[PDB]
């Protein structure tokens, strides 16, 4: 088993004896490589500091792989982080939070992966939630943020491809760039009509967004607005301005533990090492100085990604999406409670899903229970 | 995919058609069976006539 | 009261004379001077901007261009979401709004440049024209702009389009696309390629004898200029983006627009200077909304290249592009466009085919298939 450096970058408070224990706990005897576990810590969120840590990666020893987790709200941190790793062109995996957050604008050679699938799969699960909500009429509202034409795009892909008449009112495009002095976003709120609608933006974006929603107050009883995980932002961060009881979905914060999944991602780097020296008949050559690595880059072989394509471990499939997302991630639906706490709304298992209740919470007209016996005509 | 023969009153309308505007008459077959339709692929999300 | 900005490039002379630009700038409470070089290693260079520029807390960092690699600052300023000052990039992948939120350069997209060629339709008066392109992302979006002008005319209502080409980098034989051009009657084809790609085009054409008189290979100097000129078939259809030269003129009006905005910049309310300390600070400078807002609000009276402005993309506007062609296998300037106004040059622009004329090559083929 070739020794492979396993560098766990722990952001903020974490249990190192638990994670490192799992590193000692989990050892793959069917593996042709050996882990060298490393616990890295940076108390600061400075992107520059992140870069300095990248310098620490090889500065410590030859770096086999980069495991970093995020407890903070800064996604672009993970972004330019993956940019740095792209300059490094080495294996790296975001383990939590922003590090686990969906990374827009996948770079050409970027190998960065994380637990959980793309917003692509996400919104699909949202449609499934509509199947739960059984409200066939809906719409979409979003700002100019990345994945816009993508989210609306595959959204439409769900739309027109159906054998059922499930209605889609429209798709509301917005942006943060235009001067808010016009307040025309409030007019877009006036444009909001349909009982169900889709909402896509960031949580920081949800500041002005949902703030204006309170301005229109259009979110009142009967108004269906739901957003994804990163759209909702952090699990434990609840702003007051967030929509009451708003439906959402995420990778599992409650079920899936970050230090728990740490050993998992370790095993992911392992399964990466599984076929590496076997088929390639070579070992990873770490760049001594990544800034000075411009020389050794001639012999680079991208088959590591080709190796990284199909992967499975511990009964879990470590294969990832060619777009970089998770090939078959597990989903968790959630919504805020009367305590202003996001409460698990269900889980989407592949296409399949399981709701937590036979009906939405539902929190004027009521029911019209409309019980009947079918007698044709 | 093999050489075959072409005859039809439609095809005839092609014959007289070129008989109006001279052009070298070339005859092809249809790969698939259908006529044509705008169709959504499994990727890239672009409706495509077929 | 000190207005500070950064700079990153190779030329030390451009750095000193750039400080002179700061000198005339503070006049044109006074500005402060800051600058940096452009290092080979994007890692430690990004580190350089990190240490210096943050500590500098500059209003913007001037950037020239000594594939996607040469934009580490694109990663950098975003950490602060800071105003970005570019110069030498004609590549619009750097102008992609996704990655870079606010990034401003002095140069138009070479893709958006070929809109010049879209007018060159009105020049050659050739309705039917073909799309020749290599396969790549930047090229893909470039063709997307080609269509943008194309259907732009449609709604604007005969700019006849045609098939498009996709050639992966290092294509061995383009005879699929190259030979496929023979299926096109009209000889007007808009070419899109990188350096060695354009080489494969050059060695490709007459190899299939598709170079035959009247066949129009139309692209930009970005494709045409440089080593391409070696094997380039003479008199090929092409043009160069005007005024793009060297660090001098780029650096010249740069601080011009910078301070020209800095005037109304301090005029804002609840204003805040450029954030300084990077360590531990995850909050980007909120002035960036008003700073880049002003960059958008920025329309410059007179720059070194003339009247300076830009569209929502924020690079240039109505820029000039010099028309040129090889005269007896020697590149000779064929003219320029104002942004919209094509200037016919003195000499007659030769056609590598018969004389100088622009023929009509869309004449139908006898073969009629159904």
UniProtKB/Swiss-Prot annotation, chain A:
Tissues with expression: Expressed in the hippocampus including the dentate gyrus (at protein level). Detected in adult olfactory bulb, brain cortex, hippocampus, striatum, thalamus, superior colliculus, with much lower levels in inferior colliculus, midbrain and cerebellum.
Result of changing residue 328 to A: Normal zinc binding
Highest rank taxon of the organism: Eukaryota
Disulfide bonds: 55-290
Outcome following mutation: residue 252 to A: Slightly reduced zinc binding
Provenance organism: Rattus norvegicus (Rat)
Amino acids binding Zn(2+): 96, 253
Variant or mutagenesis effect after changing residue 29 to A: Normal zinc binding
Glycosylation sites: 43, 310, 317
Summary of subunit composition and partner proteins: Heterotetramer. Forms heterotetrameric channels composed of two GluN1/zeta subunits (GRIN1), and two identical GluN2/epsilon subunits (GRIN2A, GRIN2B, GRIN2C or GRIN2D) or GluN3 subunits (GRIN3A or GRIN3B) (in vitro). Can also form heterotetrameric channels that contain at least two GluN1 subunits and at least two different GluN2 subunits (or a combination of one GluN2 and one GluN3 subunits) (in vitro). In vivo, the subunit composition may depend on the expression levels of the different subunits. Found in a complex with GRIN1, GRIN3A and PPP2CB. Found in a complex with GRIN1 and GRIN3B.
Domain remarks: The extracellular N-terminal domain (ATD/NTD) endows NMDARs with a unique capacity for allosteric modulation, harboring several binding sites for small molecule ligands that act as subunit-specific allosteric modulators of ion channel activity.
Localization per record: Cell membrane; Postsynaptic cell membrane; Late endosome; Lysosome
Extracellular compartment segments: 1-377
Recorded consequence of changing residue 253 to A: Reduced zinc binding
Processing and modification events after translation: Phosphorylated on tyrosine residues.
Name recorded for this polypeptide: Glutamate receptor ionotropic, NMDA 2B
Annotated consequence of substituting residue 96 to A: Reduced zinc binding
Family stated for the protein in its record: Belongs to the glutamate-gated ion channel (TC 1.A.10.1) family. NR2B/GRIN2B subfamily.
Function: Component of N-methyl-D-aspartate (NMDA) receptors (NMDARs) that function as heterotetrameric, ligand-gated cation channels with high calcium permeability and voltage-dependent block by Mg(2+). Participates in synaptic plasticity for learning and memory formation by contributing to the long-term depression (LTD) of hippocampus membrane currents. Channel activation requires binding of the neurotransmitter L-glutamate to the GluN2 subunit, glycine or D-serine binding to the GluN1 subunit, plus membrane depolarization to eliminate channel inhibition by Mg(2+).
Swiss-Prot record, chain B:
Post-translational modification: NMDA is probably regulated by C-terminal phosphorylation of an isoform of NR1 by PKC. Its phosphorylated state is influenced by the formation of the NMDAR-PPP2CB complex and the NMDAR channel activity.
Origin: domain of life: Eukaryota
Subcellular localization, as worded in the UniProt entry: Cell membrane; Postsynaptic cell membrane; Synaptic cell membrane; Postsynaptic density membrane
Tissue expression remark: Detected throughout the brain, in brain cortex, cerebellum, thalamus and olfactory bulb.
Glycosylation sites: 22, 42
Domain remarks in the Swiss-Prot or TrEMBL record: A hydrophobic region that gives rise to the prediction of a transmembrane span does not cross the membrane, but is part of a discontinuously helical region that dips into the membrane and is probably part of the pore and of the selectivity filter. The extracellular N-terminal domain (ATD) is a site of allosteric regulation to modulate overall receptor function.
Family: Belongs to the glutamate-gated ion channel (TC 1.A.10.1) family. NR1/GRIN1 subfamily.
Subunit and interaction comment: Heterotetramer; the NMDAR subunits are modular and harbor tiered domains that function in concert to regulate opening and closing of the cation-selective ion channel pore. Forms heterotetrameric channels composed of two GluN1/zeta subunits (GRIN1), and two identical GluN2/epsilon subunits (GRIN2A, GRIN2B, GRIN2C or GRIN2D) or GluN3 subunits (GRIN3A or GRIN3B) (in vitro). Can also form heterotetrameric channels that contain at least two GluN1 subunits and at least two different GluN2 subunits (or a combination of one GluN2 and one GluN3 subunits) (in vitro).
Primary role: Component of N-methyl-D-aspartate (NMDA) receptors (NMDARs) that function as heterotetrameric, ligand-gated cation channels with high calcium permeability and voltage-dependent block by Mg(2+). NMDARs participate in synaptic plasticity for learning and memory formation by contributing to the long-term potentiation (LTP). Channel activation requires binding of the neurotransmitter L-glutamate to the GluN2 subunit, glycine or D-serine binding to the GluN1 subunit, plus membrane depolarization to eliminate channel inhibition by Mg(2+).
Protein name: Glutamate receptor ionotropic, NMDA 1
Positions spanned in the full protein: 450 to 499 of 938
């Amino acid at each position: 088993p070739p020794s492979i450096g396993i560098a766990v970058i722990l952001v903020g408070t974490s249990d190192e004896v638990a994670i490192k224990d799992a590193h000692e706990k989990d050892d793959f005897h069917h593996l042709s490589v050996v882990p060298r576990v490393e616990l890295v810590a940076m108390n600061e969120t400075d992107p520059k500091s992140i870069i300095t840590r990248i310098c620490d990666l090889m500065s410590d020893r030859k770096i086999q792989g980069v495991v970093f987790a995020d407890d903070t709200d800064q996604e672009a941190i993970a972004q330019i982080l993956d940019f740095i790793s792209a300059q490094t062109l080495t294996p790296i995996l975001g383990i939590h939070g922003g590090s686990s957050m969906i990374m827009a604008d996948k770079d050409e050679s970027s190998m960065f992966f994380q637990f959980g699938p793309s917003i692509e799969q996400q919104a699909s699960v949202m449609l499934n939630i509509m199947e739960e909500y059984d409200w066939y009429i809906f719409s979409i509202v979003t700002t100019y943020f990345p994945g816009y034409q993508d989210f609306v795009n595959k959204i439409r892909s769900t739309i027109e491809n159906s054998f059922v008449g499930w209605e889609l009112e429209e798709v509301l495009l917005l942006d943060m760039s235009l001067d808010d002095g016009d307040s025309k976003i409030q007019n877009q709120l006036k444009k909001l009509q349909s009982p169900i609608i889709l909402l896509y933006c960031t949580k920081e974006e949800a500041t002005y967004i949902f703030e204006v929603a309170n301005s229109v107050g259009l979110t009142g009883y009967g108004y269906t607005w739901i957003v994804p995980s990163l759209v909702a932002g952090d699990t434990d961060t609840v702003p007051s301005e967030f929509p009451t009881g708003l439906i959402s979905v995420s990778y599992d914060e409650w079920d899936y533990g970050l230090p728990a999944r740490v050993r998992d991602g370790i095993a992911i780097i392992t399964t990466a090492a599984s076929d590496m020296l076997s088929e390639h008949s070579f070992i990873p050559e770490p760049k001594s100085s990544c800034y000075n690595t411009h020389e050794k880059r001639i012999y680079q072989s991208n088959m590591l990604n080709r190796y990284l394509i199909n992967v499975t471990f511990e009964g879990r499939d470590l294969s990832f999406s060619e777009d970089g997302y998770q090939m078959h991630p597990k989903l968790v639906i959630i919504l805020l409670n009367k305590e202003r706490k996001w409460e698990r709304v269900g889980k989407w298992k592949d296409k399949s899903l399981q709701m937590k209740y036979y009906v939405w919470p539902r929190m004027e007209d009521d029911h019209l229970s409309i019980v009947t016996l079918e007698e044709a005509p | 995919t093999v050489p075959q023969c072409c005859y039809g009153f439609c095809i005839d309308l092609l014959i007289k058609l070129a008989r109006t505007m001279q052009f070298t008459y070339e005859v092809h077959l249809v790969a698939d069976g259908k006529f044509g339709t705008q169709e959504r692929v499994q990727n890239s999300n672009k409706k495509e006539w077929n | 009261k000190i207005v500070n900005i950064g700079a990153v490039l190779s030329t030390r002379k451009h750095e000193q004379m750039f400080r002179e630009a700061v000198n005339q700038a503070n006049k044109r409470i006074q500005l402060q001077a800051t600058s940096v070089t452009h290092k080979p290693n994007a890692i430690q260079m990004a580190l350089s901007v990190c240490e210096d520029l943050i500590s500098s807390q500059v209003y913007a960092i001037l950037v020239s261009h000594p594939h996607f690699t040469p934009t580490p600052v694109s990663y950098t300023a975003g950490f602060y979401r800071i105003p970005v000052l570019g110069l030498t990039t004609r590549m619009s992948i750097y102008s992609d709004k996704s990655i870079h939120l606010s990034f401003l350069r002095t140069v138009p997209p070479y893709s958006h440049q070929s809109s010049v060629w879209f007018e060159m339709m009105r020049v050659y008066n050739w309705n039917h024209i073909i799309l020749l392109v290599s396969d790549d992302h930047e090229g893909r979006a470039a063709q997307k702009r080609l269509e943008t002008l194309l259907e732009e005319r449609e709604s604007k209502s005969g700019p006849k389009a045609e098939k498009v080409l996709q050639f992966d980098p290092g294509t061995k034989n383009v005879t699929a696309l190259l030979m496929e051009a023979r299926e096109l009657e009209a000889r007007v084809i808009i070419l899109s390629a990188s350096e060695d790609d354009a080489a494969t085009v050059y060695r490709a054409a007459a190899m299939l004898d598709m170079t035959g008189s009247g066949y129009v290979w139309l692209v930009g100097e970005r494709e045409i200029s440089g080593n391409a000129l070696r094997y380039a078939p003479d008199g090929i259809i092409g043009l160069q983006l005007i005024n793009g030269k060297n660090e001098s003129a780029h650096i010249s009006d740069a601080v011009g627009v910078v301070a020209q905005a800095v005037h109304e910049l301090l005029e804002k309310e609840n204003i805040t200077d450029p954030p300084r300390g990077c360590v531990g600070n995850t909050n980007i400078w909120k002035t960036g909304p008003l700073f880049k807002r002003v960059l958008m609000s920025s329309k410059y009276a007179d720059g070194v290249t003339g009247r300076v402005e830009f569209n929502e993309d924020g690079d240039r506007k109505f820029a000039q592009y010099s028309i040129m062609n090889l005269q007896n296998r020697k590149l000779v300037q064929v003219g320029i466009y104002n942004g919209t106004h094509v200037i016919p040059n003195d000499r007659k622009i030769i056609w590598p085919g018969g004389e100088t004329e622009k023929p009509r090559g869309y004449q139908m083929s006898t073969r009629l298939k159904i």
